[PDB]
């Protein structure tokens, strides 16, 4: 049962990741 929970876990966080990667690419061009 632990597996089913772990897999889905790394799936939820993965979403919040691609979210910030979209916020920094906007400032970089201005800062660096």
From Swiss-Prot:
It comes from the Eukaryota. This is Antimicrobial protein CAP7. It comes from Oryctolagus cuniculus (Rabbit). The chain holds residues 135 to 166 of 171 of the full protein.
